[PDB]
Structure formats: C-alpha cells, structure tokens
Write a protein that binds this ligand. Structure first.
Ligand SMILES: Nc1ncnc2c1ncn2[C@@H]1O[C@H](COP(=O)(O)OP(=O)(O)O)[C@@H](O)[C@H]1O
Ligand SMILES: [Mg+2]
Lengths: 100, 98, 257, 417, 49, 256
DNA sequence: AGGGCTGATCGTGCAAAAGTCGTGCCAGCCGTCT
DNA sequence: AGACGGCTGGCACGACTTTTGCAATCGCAGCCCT
C-alpha cells in the first residue's frame, strides 16, 4: 500500500511528537539536536489471518493493529541546528494535501 | 551468495552485477548446450555454441586478457574472479592491514 | 435540477400543459399527446422523461412508422434463436430499452392492426412478447404517446380496438397550435433569432423588418418545430452585411429569379 | 428477408485452435511470460562494483543477544538465554511455550522453575517489548518502567490482571460494576494504554525496503495519453538474422529444412509478440474509454465493469479478454492496481444506475468516517445512510461492503469519550 | 530463494533463521534434521557464507 | 482545388458555386435540386473543395441504386441480422467520413420508413441498427439530390412532409444541359482536349460546322453524359481520321 | 507388374461445466428495560 | 429478569464469469508389400 505522512508513529513518546504538526512536518523556525523526528512516515504491513493474539491486541488497543512500521525521517547524530523552511512536492493525481 | 551481495540500488531491483552477470551467462549457455546435444544437432551450431561457452568461461576467469565484457550503459569492464585478486583493488590489497 | 432550453412565450396553455405534465410526473400511467405535425411533441415528451420518469431513467425514441419490415417489427420483440438467416446472436434491445423507463412514439397511426394489438396485449398485462421461445418478461415500462390523428377518428376508422384505444390513452395532453400562438409565437421567434445569431457565430445583430413579421404572420407555419423557425433564420441568413434584414424567401424554388 | 433454415452458405473460416495460440496468449503472464519466452528462445535455435555497505542491526535480536551475553551469565545460563532469545518473534512475543522450551532442553536436571527464572531474567532484557507474552504483560512491564505517579495505574493493573476480557469486549458497564470504575477514569486508563508501545518490536524493525513493479502505466498526461505498459520492459526479442542467412545458405537440404522450421517457429513467436502488443494497446484504449471518468468521479463513484462488455467494446474474443485480465497489473497516478481490481463488480443501484461493490464500500467508508467516535455506526445506520445515498443496497449488501472495508463491530469499536 | 538456481535453498545453506523455506520444522528444537517437502539443514545463517 | 472539374462559365453556375461554398463552410443539411445527368457530384466536388474538412475529403458518392430492402440494409447493417455475416455497418455511410457531409441520391424511391430514417438523420439522431440499441452518434452534415419536385410527392403523400421540409433547409437548384447553351462549345473543347489526352491523340484536330450544328440539334439529355458520348465517338473516329470527320455520333443500335 | 500408404504443412476461440458472486433471510444472543 | 432489537453469520438460490481441453486432411510420390 501507499505510504502517507500523518504523524501516527507507534512506540514513541508524546514529547518527541510534541513538536510535530498534524501532517507530520515540523513548524518553521524550530531548532533541533541529535536524532529528533522531522517527517513522520510509516510503512504498511501485509494483512494476517484471524490470529486471535493480535486480534485481541487490536480489540484492546486498536488504531495500530501492527499495520504500519516506524519509518520516520530523523536528524543524523552529531548534528544540531535550526530549520529555515520546508518544502513538499506532490505528483498529479494525488490530492491528500493535509498541510501542503 | 554471501560473498556476492544483492545490493539493491533502487530497492525495486536487486541488480547483482560483476559477480552474477557472468554466472548467469555461463549458466544459460551451458543449459542450452546440454539440451542441445541430446537433440542430435548439426555440427556447425554445436561447435559455435561450445565456442561461445568456452569464451564465456574465459571471460568469467579473466575478462581483461581475452574479450571485453561491459555492463548496461557502462563501457567499463567487469571484475572477474581474478580481478578481485590482482590490482590495487584486489583481496591481497587491503589485506596488508588496509 | 437541469432544465432544457425552451423558447420564451406568453402561452398560458403551454404553462398549463407543463403543470399537468408535472402532476402526472409522480404518476406512472400512459400519456397521450395530441401534437400535430411539427409541434415538437418529442421535446415535450423528453422534458416529461426528465421529471415523469425516475431521475436518470432510460428513454427510447422509436417511431413505428420508421419500421421497415413487419418481420423486423417482430424482431423488435426479442428473439431467442432460430430466427432470420443468422440466429447466432439475437438482442432486440427495444424491450431492454423499455425496461426501467418509459415508451415514447410518434405518429402511431401507421401501425398494422396486429402490431397495435400485440402492443396492447403487452402493455396492459406488462409482459413482453418474445420472438424466440422464452418465458415472457413483465418489464415495467411506462408509455408516452404523441400522434396527429384524433383517437375517435381512428375508432370510427376502427384501426385501434376499443380496449387498445382506451388502455393506450389514459391521459390527454393537447399541444397548442403554432397558429394558435400569436404573441408567444413572436416572442419565441425573437428567442430563436437570438439563438441562431449565437449559433452562426455572427457578432452583428440579426435584425428584423416589419414587412417580414407581417409575412411570417401570413405564413401558415403548421409546424411549431424549430425547423420552421430554422427555415426563417436561414432566409435571414441569405442576407448579410446589413444590421436589419429586409424581406425573405418562402422557398428556394420560390422567387428563383 | 425473414425466411428460416434456408440454403446454407459455405463456411469460409475455421476456429484453428492451437496450443501454440493459447501459449501465445500466455494469459498475459507478463514477467512469467518473459521468463517463458526466454526459455523458448534458449530452446529455439538461431534465436537472438556497487557500494555494498552491508551494515545493519539484526532487528535488535543481535543487540539482545549481545546484551544478554554482556550481562554475566553462566555457560549453561548463557545457552538457556540464547535458546530463549531464539524463541522471539518480530513483535517480541515468545512463539514456543515454557514446556516446549523445557522439552527442547532435553535435560532431566532442567526444570520449570529454573526455566522460569531464566526467562524472568531474560524478560527484563535490554530493550522494551522483551516480555515474550501478551501485550498486557508487556503493558505491566511498561508500567513498572513508568513512574508510579501515573493516575489510575493501580486500576489499570487490576483491569489487566483478570479483567482483560472485560476490556477486550468493551463491556464498560460490567467492567465498571466489577472494578468500581469511576466516570471518565476509564478514559484516563485508555489514554494511558494508548501510550503503551504496543508491538514494540515493530518499531525496532524500522527498515522496510519498498517493492513495486512497473507493469502498465496510466499517467494519461493531457488525457488519453498512450502511456505504454512498460514497453521498455517488453522483451521484443528477435531471431538471429546472421544465423538465418547461414541457414538459408546451408548446403545440406536437411539443414535447410531445419533452418526453415526454426524460421517458422521464429515467425510464430513474432506473431505472438505482436498479438500481445496489440491486445495490450486495445485493452489500454478500452480502459481509457472510461478510466478517466472513474478517476475523476472517485472510488466511491465507480461504475460497474463487465469483462464481456469490455470485450464487446474491443470486439475481441471474450475469453481472450478474460485471459488477458489475469496476472495483469496497471500502475496509475492514483496507484498500482490489478486488472481485476481495474474491473468493477456489478451491483444494482437506484435511478437506473449500476454501482460497483468497491464504490459502495468506499461510500460506506466515507460514512464511517462521519460517525460519533464514542459509538460506532450500526449496520442498520449504515443501511439508512445508503438509502439516503440511494444506492439500492440493503443491510446485507452494506455488511458485505463493510467486510470488504474491514469495518470493526459496532460494540467492539464503541469506546468511552 | 529460487528452486535449483542462484541464491536458492537446498544449496549454499539455510536461510536467515532456523526456519525452513517451506515453513515447517522451524525451531531450534530441530538441530540437524531435514524436512521432507523441503530439503534444508536446520542450522545457523553464517554457514551460508 | 479538385482539378476544377466541369468548369461552368455560366454566371448562374458561378452563383451556385458561391452558394455551395457557403454551404460547405456550414455543417447543416442542404438540398441540391438537380436533374438526371446534370450536376453529377460536380457541385459535390466543389463542396469538398470548399468543405470545412478540406484536408479530410467527405464520403460524397451520393449516387446509389438499390432495392428497397437493399436500401434499408444500407441504412442499418448488423453482423447477426440478415443474410450477410460478420459484417456490421457494412455500408458505413457515416463511417465512410466522420463529419463531412452525408450525401444521398434518388430519395424518391426511398420508402416512408426510409424517408423517416432520412429525416432522423437530418436532425441530431442515432444510427440505424437491425438489432440492439445504437446510442452511437456520429455527427455529419447532410446533402441530397433528386430529379423530382418533392412538393408534389408530399402533396401526393409519397414522402414524409417533415423529411421534405427539414431536409429542404436550402435547395440548391441545378441547371441542365439544355440550360447550358453558350458554354456548350467550351465544354466540347475541354472534352476534346481530355479525350485527346486519354486516347493518346496528338491534339484536338478541330471541329466542323456540321458537327456543331448536329450537336446543337442533339437533345443532349446529359449535362456531361451527352458530352461524354460525343467526345468518345469523336475520339474513336478522329484517332484514325486525324481530322474533324464531320460529326461522329454514338447510338446503342446501328443498322446499315 | 500393381496396390497401400506413408508424413511434409495445414494459425486469436470458445463453451460448458464448474465456480463464484449478490442478495436476501432466518436463528440465536447479548445489552437492555422494563 | 424475560423479552425488545440489532448484529452477525451461516444458508440458500439465481446470474455472471471463465478455463481448459480440445487439429483434420491433405496431394505431393516413392517405397515396400504382394
Ligand atoms: N417551446 C419550445 N421552445 C423551443 N423549441 C421548441 C419548442 N417547441 C418545439 N420546439 C422545437 O421544435 C423542434 C421539433 O419539435 P417536435 O415537432 O416536437 O419534434 P417531432 O418532429 O419529433 O415531433 C425541436 O427541435 C424543438 O427544438
Ligand atoms: Mg418527431
């Protein structure tokens, strides 16, 4: 399936996501040090059978179902700085444009 | 295969080169010879195919000596089983604590 | 929602007919139009199909007079197999065109008596005649009619059976005559002139002459169709480079000199 | 011109069904067809470094093994720990039971208590998600790692202890009655459970190479563009002209006959390739006849598509079109879909229309998007919404579409506000 | 891995894990056995080199 | 330029040509009031010369003779229906030239159903098909020509009045051979040159006053057919004669 | 001297049984309110 | 605290699809059997 940016990264703290906007990119003018998340991207996973284990896990937790994996863009280590501006290009035929 | 990694460039295609291209050539050529002889083929075509096969094996061993094999869109030669032994970029190099 | 372009005219009869069409629109009953030749009854029927039928309902305009061979008219009813020279594939489609829609016809006078009787025995019960051996289909199709001749006239002639004439004519929609409309006729003429000026892609105004209007009043114009208006607009088109045209030609053979 | 069973005209054509023709169709085997063509061309006579970084973490399994080895463990203890670590899934839950591990040990001295102690030492491993049990146990481990100041931690622990079934069925009434749950306290507990890192091992496996095949192209620049169906990837192989000339110049009559047979086979292959290309072009034209309408209208506005109707429009054989549809992929600006996915299911719709089952499913998904988060929309509510849309789809059809859309159950999807 | 080709099973050794290519006999409890539907020794991945 | 076939020096001919040029700029039905042997597609040739689809020539080919069932089949052709097989829309009148202008002749012989189909063709109408539904709509202009006064036939009730009226958007009257008197000599000279070219004759050796008098006295029913026959006879005779040879006439029957 | 008879070359389909989907519908069950 | 309701899912029956399993007879004429 296609991969989209919607900032729904599992197995991550709210503080790391505390600076992320809804579409996933960071606000203009921020600062960053280390390996902080910049753009939130996930990878879809293949569907499974009934499989009562994660069926129960989804029934209790939900909204993840292990459907996606954490594949977000992060700053390389030993790098600290501040952002100037962002830019995104979308091909014709796709009009998600959450914050484009 | 552990010595000849797939090394995907684009992820879509593994594109193994310089280690499996010549293997692919020799494998397909040998299969063609091997079903060819059992079909009672005429002499001309079988000797031509065997000459192709011997040339391919030679190129797999040493390409620089005999023949010139190049990759897609690149005219540079291939790195044969002897190429990764000899020269500044062989196994013996970088063996001396490189 | 979407309204087809129509000529503007002060014809309260036309508005009453439109209101009656709207009233019968929720209704699903046979509709008969008394439209004479060139009255554009087909346009009225289509406008009905916009509202009288369900939204985006199938429509079909097949004229019985257009039928060539009565054997083909039989083929207009579905043939299963073993019909005509080639029985490989058979799909009349008229009943399929009928299914999920209404039925519209023009000049239903010319039909053979057998054709009309079969039409009655199909419409009244709702079952579909099949040329090939098959169970008939009760296709729910409305029926709309538009003919010139009087129904009692054919009854006196006997062409339509009493059962057929009755069950065929459930509602009557008399089309106003073109000669009946005088001021509405002039307004529709002006509107058609504007539409023709737009169509011809001529920026200059068409223009009219009082003598031309008097002559048009003299013209019988039995057909209220755009065709008579198109003929008038063509007589105008024969004149160019003048803001207001003068005179007109009744027929091309007329005034040959 | 209506006589029946008259004089029969002489047939001037034949079916000529050949297994060669069927193989030429290849059911549009595409890459498989390419491999078959390569095999035939090999069987047909007279026919035709990188960077290599090699560096990646072993999904923390190597990291876990090192950390366990980093901790001081006895040789037997190290072996037991390695065996336990081997019994780790990507999610982080143990596939084998403790009894299975003890049986794999095959030692009379090895016991359940020692195995449990080893697992518990292994359970508190280096990374999160090393519980090797249900996520509730992993949730307990996370809560132990989490500060005790978190509200409703004791209530969450009590619920996870033996009231897990109550949480699974979202039976708020019975769960609250049993656990004396306060109003909106369950909301706080649910919010805390949201930050429980379910499937922690999935995040560790951040690497995920992309897999996609070009196949057909639906770029359609400026509308109706002839986006070739991977014309570059099409083999278009040809026989050896020089060898053919040698066969033409063969002195031996038998050799010349063999060369002629090879040339006939090559002509058959050329005809097969030309037929494949022509079928691809015709299918592209037929799809483009209505693909733009579907793309602009949307997935929920998808008209039904009939393979027989498409073949009739293309005027080719219906069975041929059906065979071509199989094992065919068409990448589009919207995305890559199968030819069957390109085709649309048939379902009745109101107002003299036909609605695709996928169209109804997309409409139902859009409706499910517009729903109260606390209470999921009922299938009866979905049927009412469909009736509002006028798609002539009842409760059964709505349920089928929901199964296609994997809509959760109304009670299961129901949650507190 | 392909069948009787480059980068294949039953040749050059087992796959990334002890799990067999077919899918059965996937456990360290199997140490030297070989499955029937697939012929692969249940061993480490390093031996592939 | 269409080789300017049958260049008529008559002023009425020039006016008719200008009107035809105006009609070809248009894409609406138009009636050509012609007569037998007169204006045999020459006006149609001029229209194609001035057609909006100048690059893409129209079907033309208005002239056609066929049975009633045959004409109906020419209107509607389906592969399964009728005797012929595997050929649907075998005539393909609209399929012959998209847009352009559909051309018809001898509409008098057309049946009432045939006339009704013609009328539906005159307005925006769907194609005719023996079986199924023909939602296919191919826009194309209309041209037609008959030698009779259809006003009488409508008065006689031999043709659809609606078809006669709507088709008669603008009747293109045509002049016959009897109409052409002064241009007759020019047409004869042009035909002589064309025959000398085709018959490999060195040139037009010349005419005779007796030959001109006989040609004038000749009824000459065809506008060019009489001219064609006279030219053929003169080419056959003078080719051996290498002289005017008085008048050479062609008769279906010869005695003594 | 007369009969047998042998293999070259002979090109876009389909249909019929099977399968499978659309749609409707009944039977039980749990959440609930009486 | 037993019944209202809606779900869900199995169960069924027509309507559309679709896949595989299907190729002689030549017109040459020389060779072999009789
Ligand atoms: N009220 C109106 N406004 C505009 N056009 C009209 C009106 N009534 C009739 N017409 C025109 O008359 C033409 C033919 O009308 P009609 O006689 O109903 O067709 P038919 O010959 O099929 O009966 C149509 O093209 C239509 O545009
Ligand atoms: Mg009409």
């Amino acid at each position: 399936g296609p991969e989209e940016i919607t900032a729904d990264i599992p197995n991550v703290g709210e503080a790391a996501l505390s600076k992320l906007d809804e579409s996933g990119i960071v606000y203009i003018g921020a600062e960053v040090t280390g390996g902080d998340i910049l753009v939130g991207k996930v990878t879809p996973k293949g569907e499974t059978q009934l499989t009562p284990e994660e069926k129960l896990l989804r029934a209790i937790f939900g909204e993840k179902a292990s459907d996606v994996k954490d594949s977000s863009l992060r700053v390389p280590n030993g790098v600290s700085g501040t952002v100037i501006d962002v830019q995104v290009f979308t091909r014709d035929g796709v009009e998600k444009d959450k914050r484009a | 295969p552990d010595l000849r990694p797939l090394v995907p460039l684009d992820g879509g295609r593994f594109a193994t080169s310089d280690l499996n291209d010549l293997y692919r050539r020799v494998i397909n050529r040998n299969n063609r010879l091997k079903r060819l002889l059992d079909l009672a083929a005429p002499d001309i075509i079988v000797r031509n195919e065997k000459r192709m096969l011997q040339e391919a094996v030679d190129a797999l061993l040493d390409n620089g000596r005999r023949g010139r094999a190049i990759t897609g869109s690149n005219k540079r030669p291939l790195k044969s089983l002897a190429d990764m032994i000899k020269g500044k970029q062989g196994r013996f190099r970088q063996n001396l604590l490189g | 929602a979407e309204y087809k372009d129509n000529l503007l005219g002060e014809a309260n009869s036309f508005l009453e007919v439109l209101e009656q069409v709207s009233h019968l629109a929720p209704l699903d009953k046979p509709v008969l139009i008394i439209g004479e030749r060139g009255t554009g009854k087909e346009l009225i029927a289509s406008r009905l199909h916009y509202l009288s039928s369900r939204w985006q309902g199938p429509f079909i305009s097949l004229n019985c007079a257009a039928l060539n061979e009565n054997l083909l008219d039989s083929e207009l009813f579905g043939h299963e197999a073993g019909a005509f020279t080639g029985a490989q594939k058979r799909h009349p489609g008229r009943f399929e065109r009928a299914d999920g829609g209404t039925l519209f016809l023009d000049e239903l006078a010319t039909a053979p008596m057998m054709v009309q009787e079969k039409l009655l025995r199909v419409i009244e019960y709702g079952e579909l005649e099949r040329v090939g051996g098959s169970q008939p289909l009760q296709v729910n199709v409305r029926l709309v009619c538009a003919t010139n001749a009087d129904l009692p006239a054919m009854v006196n002639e006997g062409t339509f059976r009493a059962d057929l004439l009755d069950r065929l004519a459930f509602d009557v929609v008399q089309l106003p005559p073109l000669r009946e409309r005088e001021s509405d006729i002039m307004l529709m003429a002006e509107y058609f002139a504007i539409q023709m000026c737009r169509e011809i892609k001529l920026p200059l105004f068409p223009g009219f002459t009082e003598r031309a209007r008097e002559t048009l009043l003299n013209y019988r114009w039995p057909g209220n169709i755009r065709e008579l208006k198109n003929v008038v607009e063509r007589s105008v088109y024969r004149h160019g480079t003048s803001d207001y045209p003068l005179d007109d030609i009744i027929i091309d053979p007329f005034k040959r000199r | 011109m209506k006589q029946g069973l008259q004089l029969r005209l002489s047939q001037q054509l034949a079916m000529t069904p050949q297994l060669q023709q069927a193989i030429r169709l290849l059911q549009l085997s595409t890459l498989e067809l390419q491999q078959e063509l390569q095999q035939a061309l090999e069987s047909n006579p007279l026919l035709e470094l990188p960077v290599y970084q090699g560096e990646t973490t072993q999904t923390l399994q190597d990291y876990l093994m090192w950390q366990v080895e980093l901790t001081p463990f006895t040789d037997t203890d190290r072996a037991i720990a390695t065996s336990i670590v081997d019994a780790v899934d990507d999610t982080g839950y143990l596939t084998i039971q403790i009894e299975d591990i003890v049986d794999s040990i095959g030692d009379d001295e090895i016991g359940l208590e020692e195995v449990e102690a080893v697992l518990k030492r292994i359970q508190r491993f280096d990374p999160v998600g090393v519980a090797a049990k249900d996520l509730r146990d992993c949730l307990l481990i996370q809560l132990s790692q989490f500060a005790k100041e978190t509200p409703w931690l004791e209530e969450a622990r009590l619920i996870i202890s033996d009231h897990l079934d109550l949480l699974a069925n979202h039976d708020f009434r019975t769960l609250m009655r049993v656990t004396r749950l306060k109003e909106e306290v369950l909301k706080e507990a649910v919010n805390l459970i949201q930050s429980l890192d379910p499937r922690p091992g999935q995040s560790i496996q951040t690497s995920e190479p992309e897999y996609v095949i070009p196949d057909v192209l639906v770029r359609k620049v400026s509308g109706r563009w002839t986006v070739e169906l991977n014309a570059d990837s099409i083999p278009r192989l040809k026989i050896n002209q020089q060898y053919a000339a040698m066969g033409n110049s063969a002195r031996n009559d038998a050799d010349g006959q063999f060369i002629r047979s090879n040339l006939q086979e090559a002509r058959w292959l050329i005809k097969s390739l030309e037929s494949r290309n022509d079928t691809l072009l015709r299918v592209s034209r037929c799809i483009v006849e209505q693909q733009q309408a579907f793309f602009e209208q949307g997935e929920e506005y998808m008209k039904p598509m009939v393979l027989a109707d498409i073949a009739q429009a293309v005027e080719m054989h219906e069975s041929t079109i059906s065979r071509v549809t199989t094992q065919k992929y068409l990448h589009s600006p919207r995305g890559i879909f199968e030819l069957k996915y390109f085709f649309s299911s048939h379902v009745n719709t109101e107002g003299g229309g036909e609605a695709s089952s996928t169209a109804i499913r997309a409409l139902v998904k859009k409706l499910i998007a517009a729903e109260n988060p606390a209470k999921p929309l009922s299938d009866s509510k979905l049927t009412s919404m469909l009736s509002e849309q006028g798609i002539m789809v009842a409760r059964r059809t709505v349920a089928k579409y929901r199964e296609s859309l994997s809509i959760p159950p109304s009670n299961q999807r129901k949650q507190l506000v | 891995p392909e069948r009787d080709g480059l980068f294949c099973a039953r040749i050059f050794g087992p796959v990334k894990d002890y799990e067999c290519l077919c899918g059965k006999y996937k456990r360290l409890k199997h140490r030297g056995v070989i499955c029937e539907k697939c012929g692969v020794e249940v061993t480490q991945t390093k031996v592939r080199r």
